[PDB]
Amino acid sequence: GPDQRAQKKGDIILGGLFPIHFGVAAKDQDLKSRPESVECIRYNFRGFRWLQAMIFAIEEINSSPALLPNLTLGYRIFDTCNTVSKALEATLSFVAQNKIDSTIAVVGATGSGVSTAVANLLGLFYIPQVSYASSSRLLSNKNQFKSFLRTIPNDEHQATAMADIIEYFRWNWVGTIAADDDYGRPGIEKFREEAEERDICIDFSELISQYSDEEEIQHVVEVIQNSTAKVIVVFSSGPDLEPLIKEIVRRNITGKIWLASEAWASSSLIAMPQYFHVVGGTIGFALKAGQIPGFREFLKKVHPRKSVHNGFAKEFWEETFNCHLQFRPLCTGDENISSVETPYIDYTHLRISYNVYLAVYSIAHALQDIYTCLPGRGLFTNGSCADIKKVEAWQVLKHLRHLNFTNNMGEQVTFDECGDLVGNYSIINWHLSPEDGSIVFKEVGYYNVYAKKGERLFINEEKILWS
Amino acid sequence: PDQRAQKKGDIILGGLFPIHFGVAAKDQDLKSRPESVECIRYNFRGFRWLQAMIFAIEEINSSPALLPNLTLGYRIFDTCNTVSKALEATLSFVAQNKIDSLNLDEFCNCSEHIPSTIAVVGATGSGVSTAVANLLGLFYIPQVSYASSSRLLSNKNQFKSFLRTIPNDEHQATAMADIIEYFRWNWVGTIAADDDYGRPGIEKFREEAEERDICIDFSELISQYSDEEEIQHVVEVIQNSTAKVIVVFSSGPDLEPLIKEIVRRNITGKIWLASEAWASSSLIAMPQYFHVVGGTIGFALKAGQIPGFREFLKKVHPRKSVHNGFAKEFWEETFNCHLRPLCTGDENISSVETPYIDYTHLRISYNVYLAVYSIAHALQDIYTCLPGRGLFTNGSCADIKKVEAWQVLKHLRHLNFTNNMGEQVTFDECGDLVGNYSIINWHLSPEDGSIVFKEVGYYNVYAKKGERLFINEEKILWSGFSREVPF
Ligand SMILES: O=C(O)[C@@H]1Cc2c([nH]c3ccccc23)CN1
Ligand SMILES: O=C(O)[C@@H]1Cc2c([nH]c3ccccc23)CN1
Ligand SMILES: *[C@@H]1O[C@H](CO)[C@@H](O)[C@H](O)[C@H]1NC(C)=O
Ligand SMILES: *[C@@H]1O[C@H](CO)[C@@H](O)[C@H](O)[C@H]1NC(C)=O
Ligand SMILES: *[C@@H]1O[C@H](CO)[C@@H](O)[C@H](O)[C@H]1NC(C)=O
Ligand SMILES: *[C@@H]1O[C@H](CO)[C@@H](O)[C@H](O)[C@H]1NC(C)=O
Ligand SMILES: *[C@@H]1O[C@H](CO)[C@@H](O)[C@H](O)[C@H]1NC(C)=O
Ligand SMILES: *[C@@H]1O[C@H](CO)[C@@H](O)[C@H](O)[C@H]1NC(C)=O
Ligand SMILES: *[C@@H]1O[C@H](CO)[C@@H](O)[C@H](O)[C@H]1NC(C)=O
Ligand SMILES: *[C@@H]1O[C@H](CO)[C@@H](O)[C@H](O)[C@H]1NC(C)=O
Ligand SMILES: [Cl-]
Ligand SMILES: [Cl-]
Ligand SMILES: [Cl-]
Ligand SMILES: [Cl-]
Ligand SMILES: [Cl-]
Ligand SMILES: [Cl-]
Ligand SMILES: [Mg+2]
Ligand SMILES: [Mg+2]
Ligand SMILES: [Mg+2]
Numbered sequence: 001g002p003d004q005r006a007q008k009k010g011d012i013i014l015g016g017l018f019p020i021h022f023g024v025a026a027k028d029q030d031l032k033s034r035p036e037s038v039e040c041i042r043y044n045f046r047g048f049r050w051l052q053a054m055i056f057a058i059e060e061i062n063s064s065p066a067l068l069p070n071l072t073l074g075y076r077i078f079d080t081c082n083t084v085s086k087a088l089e090a091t092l093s094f095v096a097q098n099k100i101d102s103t104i105a106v107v108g109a110t111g112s113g114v115s116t117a118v119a120n121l122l123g124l125f126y127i128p129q130v131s132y133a134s135s136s137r138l139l140s141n142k143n144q145f146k147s148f149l150r151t152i153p154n155d156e157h158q159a160t161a162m163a164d165i166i167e168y169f170r171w172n173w174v175g176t177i178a179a180d181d182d183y184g185r186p187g188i189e190k191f192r193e194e195a196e197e198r199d200i201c202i203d204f205s206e207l208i209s210q211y212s213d214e215e216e217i218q219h220v221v222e223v224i225q226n227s228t229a230k231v232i233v234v235f236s237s238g239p240d241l242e243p244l245i246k247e248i249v250r251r252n253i254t255g256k257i258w259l260a261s262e263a264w265a266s267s268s269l270i271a272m273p274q275y276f277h278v279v280g281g282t283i284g285f286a287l288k289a290g291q292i293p294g295f296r297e298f299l300k301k302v303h304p305r306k307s308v309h310n311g312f313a314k315e316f317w318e319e320t321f322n323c324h325l326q327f328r329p330l331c332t333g334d335e336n337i338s339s340v341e342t343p344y345i346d347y348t349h350l351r352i353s354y355n356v357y358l359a360v361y362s363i364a365h366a367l368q369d370i371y372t373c374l375p376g377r378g379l380f381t382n383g384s385c386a387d388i389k390k391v392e393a394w395q396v397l398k399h400l401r402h403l404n405f406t407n408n409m410g411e412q413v414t415f416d417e418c419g420d421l422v423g424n425y426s427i428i429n430w431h432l433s434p435e436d437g438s439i440v441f442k443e444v445g446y447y448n449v450y451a452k453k454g455e456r457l458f459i460n461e462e463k464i465l466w467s
Numbered sequence: 468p469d470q471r472a473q474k475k476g477d478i479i480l481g482g483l484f485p486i487h488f489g490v491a492a493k494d495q496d497l498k499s500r501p502e503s504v505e506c507i508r509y510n511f512r513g514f515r516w517l518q519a520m521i522f523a524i525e526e527i528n529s530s531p532a533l534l535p536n537l538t539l540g541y542r543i544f545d546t547c548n549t550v551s552k553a554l555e556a557t558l559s560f561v562a563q564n565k566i567d568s569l570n571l572d573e574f575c576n577c578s579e580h581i582p583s584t585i586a587v588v589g590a591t592g593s594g595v596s597t598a599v600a601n602l603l604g605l606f607y608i609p610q611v612s613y614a615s616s617s618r619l620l621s622n623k624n625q626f627k628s629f630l631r632t633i634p635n636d637e638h639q640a641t642a643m644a645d646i647i648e649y650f651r652w653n654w655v656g657t658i659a660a661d662d663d664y665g666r667p668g669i670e671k672f673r674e675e676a677e678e679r680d681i682c683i684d685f686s687e688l689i690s691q692y693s694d695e696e697e698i699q700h701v702v703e704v705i706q707n708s709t710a711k712v713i714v715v716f717s718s719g720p721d722l723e724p725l726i727k728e729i730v731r732r733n734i735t736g737k738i739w740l741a742s743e744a745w746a747s748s749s750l751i752a753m754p755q756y757f758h759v760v761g762g763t764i765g766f767a768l769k770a771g772q773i774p775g776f777r778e779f780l781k782k783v784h785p786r787k788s789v790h791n792g793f794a795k796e797f798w799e800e801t802f803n804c805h806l807r808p809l810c811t812g813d814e815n816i817s818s819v820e821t822p823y824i825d826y827t828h829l830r831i832s833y834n835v836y837l838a839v840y841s842i843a844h845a846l847q848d849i850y851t852c853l854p855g856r857g858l859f860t861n862g863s864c865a866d867i868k869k870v871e872a873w874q875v876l877k878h879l880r881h882l883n884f885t886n887n888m889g890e891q892v893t894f895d896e897c898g899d900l901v902g903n904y905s906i907i908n909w910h911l912s913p914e915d916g917s918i919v920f921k922e923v924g925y926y927n928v929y930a931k932k933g934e935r936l937f938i939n940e941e942k943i944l945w946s947g948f949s950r951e952v953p954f
Pocket of ligand 4: 252254277
């Protein structure tokens, strides 16, 4: 498969897909010469941290005598660059054996459009796929996506929560903006429905993307400028929102109340001090934080020399310290992760990282249920058991479907009939640090998804800065 | 990959067609290894589409002028209107390319006689074509769809190798808004197939409706595989709404279960605005639904002609058609027999009415024909390329003895030829072809008792905004029969 990867041999192999870069180099192909492989661009430190959470979980599991005693979990982890084409190249390598007719499960991907394309392929071979971040309602369809599960909740609930917040403040007038993809469009469509139900009037609705040109961006900015709406609901990833926000900042459009979907509510591409005059005071959703003891210390042990199995550690180092590995100064190999602020280690809560950790543990526990299976008490024909020495992916899928374990936070993890894992949301608000000058994500509330109308939303208004 | 239509040649075109309407829905409990899904419900019109591709290729091969050195072969698979079947097929189309991408030729035992697919014709449903395009685009294999009209496929960043001989739905959705504004209708309902055809068609409709101050009372989603509760919910929304006009963006197969239940409950007096995929669908235009579905107003693509195609169609035979492995089941389904009594092998295609041969106009069939000819002409442009005047680096030319798919794509992107109807065929920068629409209205035949598609207007996409619609109000029969409005 692909050149740059994180790989380690084992008895049972987990595939991994993570956005180590935010995108791909805009060399629009006129096809005058044979297309070359496209270059990934813009290092995603947070994504590398996500990838680390998978490697951490696997090492921790292998270090546990109790969990899967006979066996070692290995891995094969690739960079998607947030792009369907790269994700799919990687995925063709995961199914290489099956297609000729060995990867037993896949953790990923991030964007719902990437996970969809991956799922169409993995589902052919009944290889289970557990996404840590793809939240589109479209992936809940088990007729189309037969092998897909996720440790993040479905956006039906988040979109409803957005309508509930607006109704809570007795607002009645908003604008909407959505990424033109399988995350933004179904999220905002559900929002529209719930908003109409609550007599919230929507003054405009625009689409954006990472690749919107100057005219498209200009048009959206003009719609925003010509509207009396103050509250703008935005369902988008950071990369898809960034070009719009840059232009809004350029024109100094001040005083908007931004309501942020979870994909950009914590995005370092948007939460930048020099945008704060436009973007300050945004209110957004975040998933519930989880804890992973020892993960931060593991993170600080990365090294381009010592990390033999993780071929992304090299570029990570070069990007962090702005150097080149043996004029771009050469890296010493002795520099200090703690001296440079990036999202790699500058975080307070683990959210998506926790979902990654749970995705791996879901797979591991499903395998453990195979290991401990007693004849007659199994899930397959005639109460038969699968053989863990010769496990097939479809058996792991079966076990993932019936999985029920208690996680380190004391919570039961099970997947519903659609492969979804239910969850609540935290509500955060963008403040400026008086110490730091940086944007701080203050928790101001939470949303309890499965409570009765009018008992779901808990907000501490006193904590909100409207700028 | 078992049943297929296949024939060797120097240059191979892939094909994808919905020979069945769907698959046997059977939730797998995964107590034993999953088996492949069963395709169900023979699609005679789709088999005709597949025939138009084979016909075009035989015609081209019979032409001394067009591609003289070379023969075009083909490898054509049934999608059953499903992503998974389409993708199994597509993995065969890219088998060679894929081995190269992963260096798999060295690390496992791999053949040296895997024939290369140079272009693919298909698929039908936009949801299927999108998934196929993600894969074909990886290898820059050109894909020319004859029916996938979603605006999403116009995105060349995502779908690098996709083109089509059908217009995208942006104008069609606009036309629906124009018609409503024309009749001063308001508080309309919308229904869309929950896929990449229905959702973006209705989204564009919503935008245009808003621009014209048309209010929408409900918006529901449906599919072929909706369960009883889902269908019941949508029928209840329709029952509880004051809306008389309902805009429906869906294929026939995705609409059929909803319509059956609407008929079951005798919901009458609705004005249905039909997207092009179901405005002529034999699954919906059935006499016994006419009390619900009569008077539907919908869109139809421009017809084209293919001399000799009808006669080619009548030549099909389970014995003689060695290359077309769908001919067997076609025969059995047409004559209700087995190779249910045994088939003689001598029965007559003209004795049984199915969509195979019971048609007036070739529309999607013509798109299929043009898709194949688009590929052939792009190849011809390679054949006739003169050094310095070529499309590649330094005005260089491709070698037609060693053509690569990406070069065909390049040529398709700049293709400009004149078709048998005297029209220029070119694709815009998004891989799209422009087309007008006829507006049709569902009448009942006084002779036949069957549903007839009366032209009552047209939509000219070349005219200025607000001057594209023409309707002849006098020709509309409301609820299918009434010249008096309202009644
Ligand atoms: O499904 C999707 O496309 C989004 C992608 C996404 C989510 N959360 C994120 C955090 C960082 C980067 C990307 C994301 C939630 N679902
Ligand atoms: O893009 C899609 O999914 C639809 C599929 C489709 C169209 N027209 C048709 C006629 C007959 C059967 C199917 C179709 C237009 N685009
Ligand atoms: C917004 O206002 C500008 C300046 O008055 C006007 O000319 C333009 O047509 C408007 N643009 C949009 C997209 O509404
Ligand atoms: C935007 O407008 C403010 C006043 O609201 C003005 O000071 C300046 O032009 C802009 N703000 C900044 C931080 O540049
Ligand atoms: C999961 O297991 C716990 C502990 O036995 C049990 O209480 C809970 O009811 C189970 N949940 C499901 C959904 O099976
Ligand atoms: C959300 O939190 C509430 C309050 O702690 C709890 O009762 C509920 O079960 C949680 N829901 C989910 C889906 O985790
Ligand atoms: C429609 O009919 C009545 C409205 O009062 C009610 O019993 C039923 O639940 C309604 N259904 C829907 C989908 O609105
Ligand atoms: C259904 O209702 C209409 C009258 O509005 C008509 O088509 C038909 O006579 C009715 N049939 C039944 C069984 O109710
Ligand atoms: C195609 O060819 C004709 C003349 O043969 C030319 O005039 C026309 O502009 C061409 N079409 C396009 C879209 O370039
Ligand atoms: C569309 O309609 C008008 C004639 O009504 C004409 O200008 C144009 O040629 C038509 N285009 C096509 C592709 O038929
Ligand atoms: Cl990803
Ligand atoms: Cl799947
Ligand atoms: Cl981000
Ligand atoms: Cl098809
Ligand atoms: Cl493509
Ligand atoms: Cl149909
Ligand atoms: Mg262990
Ligand atoms: Mg809009
Ligand atoms: Mg020839």
